[PDB]
């Protein structure tokens, strides 16, 4: 059990919006000096790919070259339902094993986007926290942002989809601003990305809610 | 190589607080059913003690020994932070793979509740989701859970702890309740559990008329 | 110089937190003064305990001695309503005597925590008195304290439990705080530690906004 291949999906923000290419990479861990012919075969919907991008093999901490293997894949083929199987061939691995990956679920879910203000316990604290609700995406390929006057605020945290009663999937995000930013007047926009919304795309402008 | 070891923690509402018995989950399942012997030498914290709770030996389907050795817990070892090492072995396992755990980690932290009403897009819907967002707190064994009216709440769903900025975790709530319920006068409570917490046990207080 | 056990139950806050849980007390009092031997045996339910702990004897003025014997006890077990036997036998008494203590028996029920403001006329004073309304509990097992902003107050004062008309029980809990820290607009909040809560414990803020 030398080579332990792992399969990963691509960037859930990059395979809906154009800005950098989406990929799935598939890059063997732990795997063994002694063996450096390794082949990296890629069978999407039966057809060999050829055009992928192989980064040479990186020294790490053990006694282990970390050889990896990149593919770009269209945002499209991978939004509709196409199989990814990623098939490694080496001397010490016995058989060659297909991880089989894809985005084929079960039905699309449009989310609803909530923004909420600060408590106002919180507007005591020096950073004040605002929230955006994501609720109703089955698929839990998302990428939730933040914005504030056409500009990122990367001062956010999004928790993982969790699974609710729905049978969908809902996360937050918390956005840590200054209280005086808040308390300003300034706004701040929760920009989303799921497939199921129109354009792939929505967002919740909040500066004052209150009623 | 054969018996295999997988250390299951308490769950935060069975360790916090008296509403259930923490129970630690030292299983020595999957003994190799070649050999009947094992050592045991229940050495918690280094020492041993002569608490040894083990179930009677299993046969399962898969040819492999299932034993439960569950151990009570007492609530002032946990706050100690005292480790929980069983030191099982075999013949064909002779080096002890009990990857002990022990809940002394860095300072706790005091977690902040904030309970935030919802936003006005969600009065359409007839589910409308309360949000308490509880941040701060380094330990992420918490128990988050809702109220109302002093009776449980359970149509409720709750993100896992996720790493914050300041190396504090947080996490949020979200209790979905009908928009009538909501827009009547009842209030609602979100109380979380955690170490760092006065009485371990803290909560607040979402009413319709709160933001 | 006859000792009749005087039976400590264990402290309401440690009942059903984990803080200083085991802590149960069978202090007896007005014990022989002439009998060096005490002998301690505590029976709950019947069953000889194996983990206990007898303080030696201490000098008394009142022409007598004092002992202190403290059982560790399990949280559910007091809880649902096992009783506890630490039977004392001597040479003046022959016939040890088996003196019980339990939760007491009937149906719980949840108290009903309310929070009222200082009055007007108390705004003049300098130091504003803050109430904890804990109506219609009916064990009189409880544990109300104040806090605010997360940190324990101890400058409150809580009334023993008081019978209701309807069988249960109730109480007011008192925290005198400066008027400064009133009118700054500062949370504070009685806790409330009862059996029949869900979750044992149940808070209930009091601020200065809390009017119209």
Redesign the interface.
């Given at each position: 059990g030398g080579p332990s291949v792992f399969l990963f999906p691509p960037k859930p923000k990059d395979t809906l919006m154009i800005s950098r290419t989406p990929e799935v990479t598939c890059v063997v861990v732990d795997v063994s000096h002694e063996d450096p012919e390794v082949k990296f075969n890629w069978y999407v919907d039966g057809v060999e790919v050829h055009n992928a991008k192989t980064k040479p093999r990186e020294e790490q901490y053990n006694s282990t070259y970390r050889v990896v293997s990149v593919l770009t894949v269209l945002h499209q083929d991978w939004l509709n339902g196409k199989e990814y199987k990623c098939k490694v061939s080496n001397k010490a691995l016995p058989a060659p094993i297909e991880k089989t990956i894809s985005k084929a679920k079960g039905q699309p879910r449009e989310p609803?986007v909530?923004?909420?203000?600060?408590?106002?316990?919180?507007l005591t604290?020096n950073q004040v926290?605002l929230?955006c609700?994501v609720?109703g995406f089955y698929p839990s390929d998302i990428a939730v942002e933040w914005e504030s006057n056409g500009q990122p605020e990367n001062?956010y945290?999004?928790?993982?989809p969790?699974?609710?009663?729905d049978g969908s999937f809902?996360?937050?995000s918390?956005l840590?601003v200054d209280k005086s930013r808040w308390q300003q007047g300034n706004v701040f926009s929760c920009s989303v990305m799921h497939e199921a919304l129109h354009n792939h795309y929505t967002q919740?402008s909040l500066d004052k809610?209150?009623?």
């Open positions: 609803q909530y923004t909420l203000p600060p408590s106002r316990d919180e604290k926290s929230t609700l609720k001062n945290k999004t928790t993982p969790v699974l609710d009663s809902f996360l937050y918390k840590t919740k809610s209150t009623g």
